[PDB]
Tab-separated table of C-alpha atoms and ligand atoms in Angstrom:
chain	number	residue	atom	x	y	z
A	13	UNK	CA	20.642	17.998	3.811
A	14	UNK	CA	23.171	15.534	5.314
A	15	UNK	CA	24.216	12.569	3.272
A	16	UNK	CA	24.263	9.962	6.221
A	17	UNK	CA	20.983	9.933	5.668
A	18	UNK	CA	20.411	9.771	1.587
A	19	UNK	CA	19.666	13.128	1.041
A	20	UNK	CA	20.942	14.949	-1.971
A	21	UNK	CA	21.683	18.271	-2.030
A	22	UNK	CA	20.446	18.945	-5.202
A	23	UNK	CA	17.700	16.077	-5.963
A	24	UNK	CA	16.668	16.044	-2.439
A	25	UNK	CA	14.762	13.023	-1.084
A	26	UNK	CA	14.801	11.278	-4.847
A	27	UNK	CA	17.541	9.059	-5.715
A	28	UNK	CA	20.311	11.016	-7.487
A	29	UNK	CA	20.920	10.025	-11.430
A	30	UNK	CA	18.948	6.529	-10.967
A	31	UNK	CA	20.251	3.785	-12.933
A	32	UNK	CA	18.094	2.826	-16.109
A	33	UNK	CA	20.311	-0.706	-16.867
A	34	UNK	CA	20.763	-4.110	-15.114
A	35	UNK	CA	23.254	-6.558	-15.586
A	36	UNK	CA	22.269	-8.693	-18.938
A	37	UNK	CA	21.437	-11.659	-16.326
A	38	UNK	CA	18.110	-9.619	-15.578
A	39	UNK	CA	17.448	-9.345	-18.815
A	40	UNK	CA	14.222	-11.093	-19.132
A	41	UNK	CA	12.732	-8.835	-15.574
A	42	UNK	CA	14.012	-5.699	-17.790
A	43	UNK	CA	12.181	-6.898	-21.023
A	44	UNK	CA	8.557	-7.476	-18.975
A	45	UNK	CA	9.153	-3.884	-17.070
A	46	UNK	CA	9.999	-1.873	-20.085
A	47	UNK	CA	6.837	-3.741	-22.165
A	48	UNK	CA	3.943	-3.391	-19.651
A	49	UNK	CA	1.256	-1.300	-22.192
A	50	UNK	CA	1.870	-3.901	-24.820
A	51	UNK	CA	2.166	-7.140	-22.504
A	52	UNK	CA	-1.202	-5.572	-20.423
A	53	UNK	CA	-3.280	-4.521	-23.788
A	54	UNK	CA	-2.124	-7.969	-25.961
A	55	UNK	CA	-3.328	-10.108	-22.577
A	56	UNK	CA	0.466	-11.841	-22.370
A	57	UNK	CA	1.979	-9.946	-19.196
A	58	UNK	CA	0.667	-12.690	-16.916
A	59	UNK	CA	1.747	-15.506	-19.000
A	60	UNK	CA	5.184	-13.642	-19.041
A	61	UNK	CA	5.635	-13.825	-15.601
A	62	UNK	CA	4.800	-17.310	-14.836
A	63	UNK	CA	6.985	-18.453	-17.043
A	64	UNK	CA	9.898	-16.891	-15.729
A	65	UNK	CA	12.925	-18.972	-14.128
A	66	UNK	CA	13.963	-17.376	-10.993
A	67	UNK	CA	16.741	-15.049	-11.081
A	68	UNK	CA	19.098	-14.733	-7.997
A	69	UNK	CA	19.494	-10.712	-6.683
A	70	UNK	CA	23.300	-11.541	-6.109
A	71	UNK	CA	24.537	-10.104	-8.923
A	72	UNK	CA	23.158	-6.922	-8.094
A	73	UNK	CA	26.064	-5.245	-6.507
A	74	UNK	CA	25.072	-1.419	-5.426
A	75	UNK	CA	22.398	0.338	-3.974
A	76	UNK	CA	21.765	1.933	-7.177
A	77	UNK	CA	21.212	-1.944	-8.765
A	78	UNK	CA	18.876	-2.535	-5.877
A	79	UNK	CA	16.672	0.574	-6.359
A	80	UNK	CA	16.272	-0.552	-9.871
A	81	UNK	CA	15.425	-3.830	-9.608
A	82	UNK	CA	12.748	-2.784	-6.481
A	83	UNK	CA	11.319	-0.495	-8.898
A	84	UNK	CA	11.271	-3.153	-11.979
A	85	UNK	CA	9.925	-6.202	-9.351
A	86	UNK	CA	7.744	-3.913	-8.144
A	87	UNK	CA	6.006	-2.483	-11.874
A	88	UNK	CA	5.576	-6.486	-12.801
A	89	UNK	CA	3.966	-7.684	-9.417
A	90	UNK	CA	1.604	-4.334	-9.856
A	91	UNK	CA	0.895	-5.284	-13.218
A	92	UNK	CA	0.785	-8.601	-13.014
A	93	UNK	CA	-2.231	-8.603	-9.557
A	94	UNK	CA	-4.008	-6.171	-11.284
A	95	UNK	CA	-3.907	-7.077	-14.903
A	96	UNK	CA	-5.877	-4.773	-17.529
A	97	UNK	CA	-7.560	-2.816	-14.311
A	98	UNK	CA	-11.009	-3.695	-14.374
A	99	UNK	CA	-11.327	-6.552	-12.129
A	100	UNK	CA	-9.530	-9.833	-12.914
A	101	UNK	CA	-7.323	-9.684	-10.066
A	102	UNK	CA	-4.725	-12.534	-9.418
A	103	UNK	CA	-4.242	-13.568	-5.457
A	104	UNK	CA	-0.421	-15.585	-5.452
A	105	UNK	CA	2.272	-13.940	-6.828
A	106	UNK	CA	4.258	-16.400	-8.208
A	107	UNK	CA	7.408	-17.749	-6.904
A	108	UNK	CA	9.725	-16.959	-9.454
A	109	UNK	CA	9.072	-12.979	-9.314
A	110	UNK	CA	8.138	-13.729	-5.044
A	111	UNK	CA	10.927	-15.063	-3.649
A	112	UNK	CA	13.516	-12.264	-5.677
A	113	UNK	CA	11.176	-9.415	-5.041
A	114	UNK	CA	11.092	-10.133	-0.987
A	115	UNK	CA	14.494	-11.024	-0.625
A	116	UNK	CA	15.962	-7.575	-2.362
A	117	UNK	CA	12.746	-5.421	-0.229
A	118	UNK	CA	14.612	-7.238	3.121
A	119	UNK	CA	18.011	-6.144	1.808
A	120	UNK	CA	16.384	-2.544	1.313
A	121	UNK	CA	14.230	-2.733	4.303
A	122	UNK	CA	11.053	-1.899	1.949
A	123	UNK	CA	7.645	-3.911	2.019
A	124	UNK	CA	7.051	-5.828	-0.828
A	125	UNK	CA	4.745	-3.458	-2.955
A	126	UNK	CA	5.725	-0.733	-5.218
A	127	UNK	CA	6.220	2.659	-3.126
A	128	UNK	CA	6.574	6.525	-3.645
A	129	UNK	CA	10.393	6.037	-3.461
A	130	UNK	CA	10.210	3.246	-6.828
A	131	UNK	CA	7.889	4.849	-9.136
A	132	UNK	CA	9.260	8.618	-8.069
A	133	UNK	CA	12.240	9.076	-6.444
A	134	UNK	CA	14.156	6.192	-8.410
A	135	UNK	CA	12.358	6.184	-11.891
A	136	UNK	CA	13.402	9.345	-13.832
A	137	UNK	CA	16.228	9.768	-16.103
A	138	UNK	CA	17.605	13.014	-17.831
A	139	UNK	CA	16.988	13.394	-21.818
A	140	UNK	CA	20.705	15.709	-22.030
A	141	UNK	CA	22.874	14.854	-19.101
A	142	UNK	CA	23.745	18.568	-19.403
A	143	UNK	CA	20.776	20.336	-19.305
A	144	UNK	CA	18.882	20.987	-15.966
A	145	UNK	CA	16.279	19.167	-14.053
A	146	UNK	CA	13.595	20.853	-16.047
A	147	UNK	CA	10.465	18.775	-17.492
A	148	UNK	CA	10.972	18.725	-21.039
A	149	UNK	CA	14.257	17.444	-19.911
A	150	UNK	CA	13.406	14.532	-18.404
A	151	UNK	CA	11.204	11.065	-18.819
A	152	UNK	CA	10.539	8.094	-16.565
A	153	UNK	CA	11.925	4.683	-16.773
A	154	UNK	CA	8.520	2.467	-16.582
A	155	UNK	CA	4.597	2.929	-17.300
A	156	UNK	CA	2.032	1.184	-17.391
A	157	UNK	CA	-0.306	1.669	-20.488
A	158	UNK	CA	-0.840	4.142	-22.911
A	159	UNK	CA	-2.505	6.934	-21.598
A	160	UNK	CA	-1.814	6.144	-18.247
A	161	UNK	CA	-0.029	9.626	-17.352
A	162	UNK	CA	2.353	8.156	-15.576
A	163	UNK	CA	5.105	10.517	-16.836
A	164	UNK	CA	3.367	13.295	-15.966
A	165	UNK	CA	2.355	12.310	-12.421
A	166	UNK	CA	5.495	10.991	-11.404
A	167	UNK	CA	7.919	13.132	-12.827
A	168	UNK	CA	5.843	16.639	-11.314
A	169	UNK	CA	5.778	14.705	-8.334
A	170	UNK	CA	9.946	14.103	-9.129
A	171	UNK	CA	10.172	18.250	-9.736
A	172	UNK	CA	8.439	19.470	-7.120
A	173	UNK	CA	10.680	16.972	-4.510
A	174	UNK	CA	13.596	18.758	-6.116
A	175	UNK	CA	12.183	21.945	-5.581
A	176	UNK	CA	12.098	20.636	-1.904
A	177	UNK	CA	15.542	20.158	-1.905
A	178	UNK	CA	16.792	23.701	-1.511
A	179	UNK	CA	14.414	23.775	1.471
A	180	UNK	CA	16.130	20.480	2.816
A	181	UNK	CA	19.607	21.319	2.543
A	182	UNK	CA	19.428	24.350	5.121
A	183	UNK	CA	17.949	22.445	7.686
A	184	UNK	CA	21.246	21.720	9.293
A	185	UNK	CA	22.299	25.537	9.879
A	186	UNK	CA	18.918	26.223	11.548
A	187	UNK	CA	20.347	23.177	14.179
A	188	UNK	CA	23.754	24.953	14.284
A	189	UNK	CA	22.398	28.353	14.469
A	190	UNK	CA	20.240	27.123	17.536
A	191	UNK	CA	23.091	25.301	19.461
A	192	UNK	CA	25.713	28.447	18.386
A	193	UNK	CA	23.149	31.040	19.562
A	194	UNK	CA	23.070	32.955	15.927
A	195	UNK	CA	19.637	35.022	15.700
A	196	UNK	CA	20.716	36.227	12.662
A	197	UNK	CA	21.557	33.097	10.908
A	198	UNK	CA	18.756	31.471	12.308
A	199	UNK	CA	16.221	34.153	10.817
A	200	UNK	CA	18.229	33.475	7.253
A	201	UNK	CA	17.832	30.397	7.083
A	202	UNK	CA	14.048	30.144	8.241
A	203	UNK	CA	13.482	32.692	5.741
A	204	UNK	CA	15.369	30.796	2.916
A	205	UNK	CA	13.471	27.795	3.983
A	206	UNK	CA	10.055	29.057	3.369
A	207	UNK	CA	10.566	30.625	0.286
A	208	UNK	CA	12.304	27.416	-1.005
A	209	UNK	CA	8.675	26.129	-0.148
A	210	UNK	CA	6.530	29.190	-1.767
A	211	UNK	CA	8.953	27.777	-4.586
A	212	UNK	CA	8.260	24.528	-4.553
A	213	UNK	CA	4.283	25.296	-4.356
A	214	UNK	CA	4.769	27.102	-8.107
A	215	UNK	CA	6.452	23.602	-9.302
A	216	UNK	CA	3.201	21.614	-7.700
A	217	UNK	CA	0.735	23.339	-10.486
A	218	UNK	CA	2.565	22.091	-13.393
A	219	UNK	CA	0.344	18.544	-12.675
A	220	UNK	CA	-2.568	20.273	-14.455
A	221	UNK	CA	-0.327	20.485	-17.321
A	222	UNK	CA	0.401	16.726	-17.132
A	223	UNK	CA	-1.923	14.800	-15.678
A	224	UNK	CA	-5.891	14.343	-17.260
A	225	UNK	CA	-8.535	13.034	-14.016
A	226	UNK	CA	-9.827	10.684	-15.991
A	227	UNK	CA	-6.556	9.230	-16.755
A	228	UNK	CA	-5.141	9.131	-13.289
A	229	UNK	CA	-8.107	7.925	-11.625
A	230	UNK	CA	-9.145	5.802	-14.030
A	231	UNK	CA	-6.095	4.400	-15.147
A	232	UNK	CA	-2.886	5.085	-12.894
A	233	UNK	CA	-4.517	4.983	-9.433
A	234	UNK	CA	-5.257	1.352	-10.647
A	235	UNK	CA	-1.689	0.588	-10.615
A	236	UNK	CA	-0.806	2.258	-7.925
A	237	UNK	CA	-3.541	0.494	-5.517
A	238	UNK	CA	-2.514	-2.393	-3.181
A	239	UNK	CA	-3.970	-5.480	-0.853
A	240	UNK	CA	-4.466	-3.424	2.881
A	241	UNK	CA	-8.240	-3.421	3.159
A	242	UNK	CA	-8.986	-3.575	-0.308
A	243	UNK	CA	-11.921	-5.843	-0.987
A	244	UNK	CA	-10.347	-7.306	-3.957
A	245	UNK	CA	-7.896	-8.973	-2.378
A	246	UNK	CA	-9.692	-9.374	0.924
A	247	UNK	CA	-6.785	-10.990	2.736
A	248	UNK	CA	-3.809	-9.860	1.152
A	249	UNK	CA	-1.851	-10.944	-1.139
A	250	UNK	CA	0.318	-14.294	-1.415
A	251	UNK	CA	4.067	-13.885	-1.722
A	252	UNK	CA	4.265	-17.650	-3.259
A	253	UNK	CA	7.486	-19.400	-1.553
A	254	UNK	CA	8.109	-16.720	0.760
A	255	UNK	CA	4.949	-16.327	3.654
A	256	UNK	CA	3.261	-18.855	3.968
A	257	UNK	CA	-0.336	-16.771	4.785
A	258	UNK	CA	-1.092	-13.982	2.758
A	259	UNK	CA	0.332	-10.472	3.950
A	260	UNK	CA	-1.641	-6.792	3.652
A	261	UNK	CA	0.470	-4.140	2.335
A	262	UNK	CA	-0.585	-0.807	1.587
A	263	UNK	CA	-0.917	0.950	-1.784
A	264	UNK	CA	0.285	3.808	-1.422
A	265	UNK	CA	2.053	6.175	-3.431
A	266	UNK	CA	1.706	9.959	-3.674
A	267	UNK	CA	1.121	10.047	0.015
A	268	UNK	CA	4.299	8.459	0.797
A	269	UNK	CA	6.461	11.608	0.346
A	270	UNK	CA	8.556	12.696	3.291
A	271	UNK	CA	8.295	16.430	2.478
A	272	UNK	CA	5.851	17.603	4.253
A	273	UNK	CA	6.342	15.193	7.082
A	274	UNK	CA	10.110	17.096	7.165
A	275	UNK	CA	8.868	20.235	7.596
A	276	UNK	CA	6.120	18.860	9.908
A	277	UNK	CA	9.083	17.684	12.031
A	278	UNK	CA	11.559	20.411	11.645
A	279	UNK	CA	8.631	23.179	12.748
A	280	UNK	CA	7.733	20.860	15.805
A	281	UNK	CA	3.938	20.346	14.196
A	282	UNK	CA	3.335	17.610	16.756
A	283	UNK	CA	1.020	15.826	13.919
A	284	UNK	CA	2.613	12.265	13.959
A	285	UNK	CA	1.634	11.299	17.227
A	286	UNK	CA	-1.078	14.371	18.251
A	287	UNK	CA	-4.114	12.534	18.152
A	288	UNK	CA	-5.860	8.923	16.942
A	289	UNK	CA	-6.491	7.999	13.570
A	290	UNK	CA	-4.702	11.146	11.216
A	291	UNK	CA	-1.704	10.466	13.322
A	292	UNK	CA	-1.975	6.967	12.521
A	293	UNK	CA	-2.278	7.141	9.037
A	294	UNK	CA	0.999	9.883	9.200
A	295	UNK	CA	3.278	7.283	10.946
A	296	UNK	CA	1.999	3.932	8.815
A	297	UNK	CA	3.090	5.960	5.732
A	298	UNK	CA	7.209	5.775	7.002
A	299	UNK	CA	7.258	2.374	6.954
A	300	UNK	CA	6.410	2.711	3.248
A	301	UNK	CA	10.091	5.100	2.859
A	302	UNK	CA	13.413	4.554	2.375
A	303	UNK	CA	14.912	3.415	6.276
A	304	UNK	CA	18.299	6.117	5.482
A	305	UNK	CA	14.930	8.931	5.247
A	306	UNK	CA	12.745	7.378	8.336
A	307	UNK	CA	15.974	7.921	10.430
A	308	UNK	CA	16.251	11.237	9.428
A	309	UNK	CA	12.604	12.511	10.010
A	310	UNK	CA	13.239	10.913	13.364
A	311	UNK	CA	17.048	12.295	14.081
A	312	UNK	CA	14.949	15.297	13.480
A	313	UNK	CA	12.401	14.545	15.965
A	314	UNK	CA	15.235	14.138	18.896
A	315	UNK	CA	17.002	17.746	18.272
A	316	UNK	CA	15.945	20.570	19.841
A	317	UNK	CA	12.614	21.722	19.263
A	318	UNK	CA	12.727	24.925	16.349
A	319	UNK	CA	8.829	26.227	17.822
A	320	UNK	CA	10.383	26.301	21.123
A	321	UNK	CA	13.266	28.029	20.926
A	322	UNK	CA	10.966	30.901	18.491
A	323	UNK	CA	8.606	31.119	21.358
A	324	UNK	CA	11.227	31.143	24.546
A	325	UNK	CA	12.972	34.782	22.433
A	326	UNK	CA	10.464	37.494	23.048
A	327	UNK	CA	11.799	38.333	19.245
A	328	UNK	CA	8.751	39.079	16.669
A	329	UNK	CA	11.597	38.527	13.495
A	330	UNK	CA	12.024	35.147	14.633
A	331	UNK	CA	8.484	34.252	15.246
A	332	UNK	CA	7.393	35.898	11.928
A	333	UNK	CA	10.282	33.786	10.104
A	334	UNK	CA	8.902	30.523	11.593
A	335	UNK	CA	5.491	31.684	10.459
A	336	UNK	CA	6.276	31.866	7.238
A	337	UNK	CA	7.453	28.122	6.839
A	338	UNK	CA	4.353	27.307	8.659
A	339	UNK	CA	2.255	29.137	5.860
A	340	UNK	CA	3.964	28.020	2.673
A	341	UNK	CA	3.334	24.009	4.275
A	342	UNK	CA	-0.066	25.305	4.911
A	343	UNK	CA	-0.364	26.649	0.823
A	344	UNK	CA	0.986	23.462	-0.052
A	345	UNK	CA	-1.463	21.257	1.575
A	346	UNK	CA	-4.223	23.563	0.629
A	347	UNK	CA	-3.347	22.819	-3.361
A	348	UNK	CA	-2.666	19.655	-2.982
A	349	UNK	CA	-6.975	19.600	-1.101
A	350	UNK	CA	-7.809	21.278	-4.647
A	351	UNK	CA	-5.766	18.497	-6.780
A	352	UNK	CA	-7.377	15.281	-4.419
A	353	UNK	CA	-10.534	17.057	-5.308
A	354	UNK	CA	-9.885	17.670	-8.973
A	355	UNK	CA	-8.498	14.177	-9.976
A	356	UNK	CA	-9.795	11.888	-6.953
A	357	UNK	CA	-13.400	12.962	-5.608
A	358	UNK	CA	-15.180	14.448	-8.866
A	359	UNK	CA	-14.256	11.674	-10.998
A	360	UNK	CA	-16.004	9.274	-8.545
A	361	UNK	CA	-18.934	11.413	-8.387
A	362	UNK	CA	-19.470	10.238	-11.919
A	363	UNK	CA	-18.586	6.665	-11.810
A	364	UNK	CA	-16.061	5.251	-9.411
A	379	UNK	CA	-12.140	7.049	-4.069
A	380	UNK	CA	-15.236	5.098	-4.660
A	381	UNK	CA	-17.338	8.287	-3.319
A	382	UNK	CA	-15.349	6.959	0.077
A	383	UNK	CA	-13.468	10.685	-0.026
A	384	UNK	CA	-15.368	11.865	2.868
A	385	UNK	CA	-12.973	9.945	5.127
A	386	UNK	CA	-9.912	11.066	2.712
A	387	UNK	CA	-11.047	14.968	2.584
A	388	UNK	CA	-11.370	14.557	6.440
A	389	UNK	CA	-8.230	12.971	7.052
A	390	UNK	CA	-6.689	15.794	4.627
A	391	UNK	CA	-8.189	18.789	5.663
A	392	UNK	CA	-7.611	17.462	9.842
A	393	UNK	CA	-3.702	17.207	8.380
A	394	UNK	CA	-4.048	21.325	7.182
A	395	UNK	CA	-5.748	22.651	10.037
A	396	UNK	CA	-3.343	20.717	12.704
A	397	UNK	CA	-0.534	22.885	10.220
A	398	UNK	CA	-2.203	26.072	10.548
A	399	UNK	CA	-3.188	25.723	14.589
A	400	UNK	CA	0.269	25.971	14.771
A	401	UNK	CA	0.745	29.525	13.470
A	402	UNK	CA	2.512	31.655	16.206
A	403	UNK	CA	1.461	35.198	15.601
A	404	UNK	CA	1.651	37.921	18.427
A	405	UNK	CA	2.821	35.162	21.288
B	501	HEM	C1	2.690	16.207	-6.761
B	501	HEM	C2	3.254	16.137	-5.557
B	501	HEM	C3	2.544	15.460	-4.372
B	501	HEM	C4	3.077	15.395	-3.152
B	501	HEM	C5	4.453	15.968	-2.736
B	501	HEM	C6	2.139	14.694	-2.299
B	501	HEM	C7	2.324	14.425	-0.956
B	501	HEM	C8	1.423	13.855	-0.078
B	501	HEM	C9	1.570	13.773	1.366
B	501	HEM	C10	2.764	14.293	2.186
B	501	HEM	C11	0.508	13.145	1.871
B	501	HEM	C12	0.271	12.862	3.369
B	501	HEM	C13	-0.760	13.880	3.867
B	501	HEM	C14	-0.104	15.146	4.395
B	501	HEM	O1	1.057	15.066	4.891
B	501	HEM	O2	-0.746	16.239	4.345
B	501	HEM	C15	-0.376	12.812	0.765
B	501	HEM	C16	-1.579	12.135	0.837
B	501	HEM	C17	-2.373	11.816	-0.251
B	501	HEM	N1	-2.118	12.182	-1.556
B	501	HEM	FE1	-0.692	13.320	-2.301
B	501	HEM	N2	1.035	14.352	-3.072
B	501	HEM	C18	1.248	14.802	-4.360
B	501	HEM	C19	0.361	14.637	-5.397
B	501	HEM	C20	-0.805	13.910	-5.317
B	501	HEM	C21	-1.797	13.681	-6.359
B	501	HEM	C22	-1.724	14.200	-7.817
B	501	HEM	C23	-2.768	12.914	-5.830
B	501	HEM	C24	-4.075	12.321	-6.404
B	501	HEM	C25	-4.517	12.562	-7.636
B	501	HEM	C26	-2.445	12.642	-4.471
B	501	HEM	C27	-3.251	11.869	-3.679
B	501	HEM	C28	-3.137	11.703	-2.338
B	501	HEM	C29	-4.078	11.006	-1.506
B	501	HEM	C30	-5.369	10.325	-2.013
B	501	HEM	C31	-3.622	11.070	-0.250
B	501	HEM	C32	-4.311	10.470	0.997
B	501	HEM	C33	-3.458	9.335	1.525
B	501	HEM	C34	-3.739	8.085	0.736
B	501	HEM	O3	-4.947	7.786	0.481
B	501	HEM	O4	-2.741	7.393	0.379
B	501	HEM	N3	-1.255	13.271	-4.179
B	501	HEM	N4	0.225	13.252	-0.410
């Protein structure tokens, strides 16, 4: 929960109160991001954008400027490669939106596609500054169309980080506890930790309440799809004035979270590097975050290991407090099975990921039961 590293104490992993304005030199980006269902549906979004003039990224003067203008660069190159969704693709991004977009993703050390930590972490705003973090409290900067969903798939993916964040801020006193030899403290916080998680799990079934299949699949997952061995763009995509070639970059986007990849670390789950292609998959997915949270996940790998010192203490509190993190990252992955299967897999069935979940169920349900080996028990 240490703030070296860009976490928040009370938001967590997601950018604390993002900034919804740029400086009236952006103007014209701003007016294409906030416009995207009518620009899309009228057929003028990619006329917009090639007419652009570039814009220099020097008058954007804080991190909080960056994040914004990641996340706006990031909604018009998404929009503008995949235009209305159903095929007519474009290959070059042009210069104008290019050159800015790759210059400010260096400065961030981001790849050039929209990621988890735009649409998500950076894109929410509160309706009442003084009310809480609740749903009907809050709304997203950017969509895409009408009907896309996109408020309620990012911002219950938005609630339940925050929910994570309770979790995420006693991490350090389970280090401390360790290194200071405190049982009891230790036991606390492992306790605390896990039912943060149960927690956070409740938060995770409000996407039912938000989110339609059809629309996500149909619509959002569109948006959210990139150029790394997508047939479409069978090479990549050009960054015009920027690379030369064309350059691969993955679409990600709900899988991009560092939660359970925290926990994953924090419990010693030796899942990022215990195996061949799941692992793989688990460690291509960091490039896609923030660089302050890929140092922590690793800062985390280098302590101490928590499953070791649990197993070296002969102490059946301690083992059945570690246990119960393990099982509430278990529940957690188990729902989020049942949500892939609800809003990804049956609505390909019918007409499409692409009936090509086989490979995602696998790599999802290898992910759970790598979790659950790792269940202590009597030992
Ligand atoms: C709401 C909160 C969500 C969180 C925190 C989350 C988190 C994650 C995480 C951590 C992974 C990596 C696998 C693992 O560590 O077990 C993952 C993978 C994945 N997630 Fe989610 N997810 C959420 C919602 C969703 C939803 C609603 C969908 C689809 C409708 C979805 C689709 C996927 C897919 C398809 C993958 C496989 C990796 C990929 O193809 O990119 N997630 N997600």
């Amino acid at each position: 929960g240490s703030a070296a590293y860009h976490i928040d104490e009370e938001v967590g992993f997601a950018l604390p109160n993002p900034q919804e304005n740029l400086p009236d030199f952006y103007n014209d980006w701003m007016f294409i991001a906030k416009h995207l269902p009518d620009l899309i549906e009228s057929g003028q979004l990619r006329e917009r954008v090639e007419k652009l003039n570039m814009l220099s990224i020097d008058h954007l003067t804080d991190h909080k400027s960056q994040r914004l203008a990641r996340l706006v660069l990031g909604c018009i190159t998404m929009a503008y490669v995949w235009g209305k969704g159903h095929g007519d693709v474009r290959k070059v991004l042009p210069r104008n939106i290019a050159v800015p977009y790759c210059q400010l993703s260096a400065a961030l050390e981001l790849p050039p596609i929209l990621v988890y930590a735009d649409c998500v972490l950076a894109n929410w705003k509160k309706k009442d500054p003084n009310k809480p973090l609740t749903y009907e409290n809050m709304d997203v900067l950017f969509s895409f169309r009408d009907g896309d969903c996109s408020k309620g798939f990012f911002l219950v993916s938005l609630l339940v980080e925050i929910a994570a964040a309770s979790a995420i801020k006693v991490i350090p006193t389970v280090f401390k506890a360790m290194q200071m030899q405190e049982r009891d403290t230790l036991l606390k916080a492992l306790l605390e930790i896990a039912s943060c998680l149960e927690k956070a799990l409740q938060v995770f079934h409000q996407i039912h309440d938000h989110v339609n299949p059809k629309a996500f699949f149909s619509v959002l997952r569109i948006y959210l799809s990139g150029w790394k061995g997508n047939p479409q763009l069978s090479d990549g995509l050009v960054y015009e004035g920027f690379w030369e070639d064309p350059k691969e970059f993955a679409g990600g986007s709900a899988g991009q979270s560092s939660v359970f990849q925290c926990f994953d670390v924090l419990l010693g789950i030796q899942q990022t590097a215990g195996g061949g292609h799941a692992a793989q998959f688990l460690q291509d997915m960091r490039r896609y975050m923030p660089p302050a949270h890929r140092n922590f996940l690793c800062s985390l790998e280098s302590n101490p290991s928590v499953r070791e010192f649990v197993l070296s203490k002969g102490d059946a509190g301690l083992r059945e407090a570690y246990d119960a993190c393990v099982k509430a990252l278990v529940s957690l992955r188990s729902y989020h099975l049942q949500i892939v299967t609800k809003y990804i897999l049956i609505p390909a069935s019918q007409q499409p990921k692409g009936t090509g979940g086989t490979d995602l169920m696998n790599f999802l349900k290898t992910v759970r039961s790598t979790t659950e080996k790792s269940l202590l028990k009597e030992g």
